[PDB]
Structure 1
Amino acid sequence: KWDYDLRCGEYTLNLNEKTLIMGILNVTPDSFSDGGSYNEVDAAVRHAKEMRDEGAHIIDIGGSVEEEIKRVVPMIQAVSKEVKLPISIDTYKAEVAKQAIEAGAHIINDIWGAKAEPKIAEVAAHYDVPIILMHNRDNMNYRNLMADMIADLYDSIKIAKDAGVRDENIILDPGIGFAKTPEQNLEAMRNLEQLNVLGYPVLLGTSRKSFIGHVLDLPVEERLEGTGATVCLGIEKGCEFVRVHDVKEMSRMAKMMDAMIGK
C-alpha cells in the first residue's frame, strides 16, 4: 500500500487501484517542417485519443535542443488541450523539460535519470512535477547487474533529492534495453522485485524491445505476446506503471493480473 497518491497538478493517479498504463505516443515527424505543422500534430492528437480510449492512464511524448522544443511543444499544447490525461515528457535535457511542463506536460521521463543533465532535477524540483529516473550508463562493466543497477539508480535519487525533489515525486525504472545485453535484460526481468527495497514506485518499459526479439526470434511488429509476458511478470514483481505501445492489449493483461494478484 502506497500511503500517498501521484500528484500531477490537474490530475491525480492512485497507485493502489491498478497498474497504471503509460501509452507511447508515436510521432511520425513531418519531413518538411521543423515542428508544429498540421499533419504531425493532428496524428499525435488522434493517436493520443485512441490510447485514451484503449485504457491509457498517461501519454508519453517525445523521442537537437533548439528543435527538440519546436517538435515537442506544439504536440503537448494540442494533446493536453484535447485529451484529459497526464502527459509525461520524454527528454533528458533540462531546457526541453522546462518548456514542455510550461507547455502543459505533467511528468518528467528521463532516460538518463538526471545524469545527462543534472539541472533537470532542479526543473523537476521547481515545477514540482513527478520525475521518472531510469537506469542507464555508457558501458556494461557490471560487476553485479542488480547490485550495480540499484547502486546506479540510487545515485540518480541522490541528485534528485539534493535538488529539492520530494520522495513522492520520484519514480524509478530499471531501464530495460539500455546498457544491458540480451541476458542482462532477462536477469533484470527475473529480479525486478529487488528495486522495491528503495521505497519508490517502479515503472517498467519493455514494449516490443530487442531482448523479446532475441528470445522469440521475431521482428518488432511480432512482439505483442512477448511484451505481454514481460508486463505480467513486471506486475507480479510489484511494478506500478508499464510503458507500452499496445494500450488495448496490455490494459487487459494488466487488469487481469491486477485481479489475480489482488491490486
Structure 2
Amino acid sequence: KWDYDLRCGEYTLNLNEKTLIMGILNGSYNEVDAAVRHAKEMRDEGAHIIDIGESTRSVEEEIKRVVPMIQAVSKEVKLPISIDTYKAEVAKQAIEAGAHIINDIWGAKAEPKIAEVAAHYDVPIILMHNRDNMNYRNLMADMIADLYDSIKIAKDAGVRDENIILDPGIGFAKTPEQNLEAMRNLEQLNVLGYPVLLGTSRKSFIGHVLDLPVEERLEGTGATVCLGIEKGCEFVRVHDVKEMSRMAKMMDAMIGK
C-alpha cells in the first residue's frame, strides 16, 4: 500500500486501487484538433493521464508546438496532463499553460534547473534513467545508482518525496539484451521506495525480439506491460490504450490490486 496520493492540482490519483494508464499523444487549427480528438479518444477507452510530448526517434519551438496543445486538451478532456520535456523553460511554460505532472527523459541530468521548476509548482515529476554513453560495470546496479543521482538532484532542488516517480528508461542507452534484462529485474527499483512508471510502448527491442515493425508491436507491448505490473510498477505509458487498459485490469485482478 502507498499511504499517500498523487495530487495533481485538480486531480488525485490513488495508487492502490489500480494500475494507472498514461496515453501517449501523437499552434494551427489542424494539429490542436487531431490532438483534442485523440486525447478524447483515450479518455474514452481507459487512460488516466494524457502525456503531451518532440518525437525523440530549438527551444522557442517546443513552447509554440506544445503550449497550444495543453490549453486545449486540459480545457476539453478532464484528466491530468503530463508534459514530456527535459528543458526547464519548456516545462515552466507547460504547467504555466496547464499541465500537471512532469515527465523528463533526462532524469534532471540534461537540465538541472528543471527540478527546481517541479519544487516550485509542486507537480509530480517522472525521472527516467538515461546516459550520454552506454557501457556498464553492472546494469541494474548502475541504473539504480543513476536514478539515485536524479532523486538527489530533485531533492536538493526542494522536490518533496511524494512527488517523485521513477522510470527505468527501457529503450534508452541500452542494448537490446540490456533492455530485456532490465525487464527481468524491474522489481529491484522497488527498493528505492517510489512509484514506478514503465514505458515500453512499441519500442525497438520488441521489434528486435519479435522481428516486427512499429504497428505490429501491440502483443509485445502487452507482454512488457504485464510482466511490468507483475513486478509491481504503478503506471504504464502506452500508445494503444484500449488494449493495454484491459491487460492492466486483468493483471490487477489476478495479482490482486
TM-score by length of 2: 0.98
Over residues 24-47 of structure 1, what are the superposed CA-to-partner deviations in whole Å (9 max), with x where a residue is unaligned? Answer: 010xxxxxxxxx100000000000
Over residues 74-93 of structure 1, what are the superposed CA-to-partner deviations in whole Å (9 max), with x where a residue is unaligned? Answer: 00000000000000000000
Structure 2 equivalent of residue 54 of structure 1: 45
Name the count of aligned residue pairs: 253
Kindly report the root-mean-square deviation, in angstroms, between the aligned alpha carbons of the 2 structures. Answer: 0.4
1:252 and 1:142 map into 2 onto residues whose CA distance is 36
Over residues 214-237 of structure 1, what are the superposed CA-to-partner deviations in whole Å (9 max), with x where a residue is unaligned? Answer: 000111100000000000000000
Structure 1 equivalent of residue 99 of structure 2: 105
Does the residue aligned with 1:122 lie in a helix, a strand or coil? Answer: helix
2:101 and 2:208 map into 1 onto residues whose CA distance is 31
Does the residue aligned with 2:7 lie in a helix, a strand or coil? Answer: strand
1:82 and 1:99 map into 2 onto residues whose CA distance is 19
2:17 and 2:121 map into 1 onto residues whose CA distance is 26
1:37 and 1:18 map into 2 onto residues whose CA distance is 37
Does the residue aligned with 1:201 lie in a helix, a strand or coil? Answer: coil
2:67 and 2:250 map into 1 onto residues whose CA distance is 36
2:173 and 2:135 map into 1 onto residues whose CA distance is 9
Structure 1 equivalent of residue 6 of structure 2: 6
Following superposition, the deviation at residue 118 of structure 1 comes to 0.3
1:222 and 1:169 map into 2 onto residues whose CA distance is 35
Structure 1 equivalent of residue 70 of structure 2: 76
Does the residue aligned with 1:175 lie in a helix, a strand or coil? Answer: coil
Does the residue aligned with 1:108 lie in a helix, a strand or coil? Answer: strand
Structure 1 equivalent of residue 23 of structure 2: 23
Following superposition, the deviation at residue 141 of structure 1 comes to 1.2
Following superposition, the deviation at residue 157 of structure 1 comes to 0.1
Does the residue aligned with 2:30 lie in a helix, a strand or coil? Answer: helix
Following superposition, the deviation at residue 133 of structure 1 comes to 0.3
Following superposition, the deviation at residue 262 of structure 1 comes to 0.6
Following superposition, the deviation at residue 191 of structure 1 comes to 0.2
TM-score by length of 1: 0.96
Following superposition, the deviation at residue 10 of structure 1 comes to 0.3
Does the residue aligned with 1:22 lie in a helix, a strand or coil? Answer: strand
Does the residue aligned with 1:38 lie in a helix, a strand or coil? Answer: coil
2:118 and 2:138 map into 1 onto residues whose CA distance is 30
Long gaps (5+) in structure 1: 27-35
Long gaps (5+) in structure 2: none
Following superposition, the deviation at residue 238 of structure 1 comes to 0.5
1:81 and 1:37 map into 2 onto residues whose CA distance is 17
Over residues 129-154 of structure 1, what are the superposed CA-to-partner deviations in whole Å (9 max), with x where a residue is unaligned? Answer: 00000000011111100000000000
1:104 and 1:193 map into 2 onto residues whose CA distance is 33
Over residues 104-135 of structure 1, what are the superposed CA-to-partner deviations in whole Å (9 max), with x where a residue is unaligned? Answer: 00000000010011000000000010000000
Runs of 4+ in 1 over 2 A off after TM superposition: none
Structure 2 equivalent of residue 32 of structure 1: none
1:160 and 1:242 map into 2 onto residues whose CA distance is 22
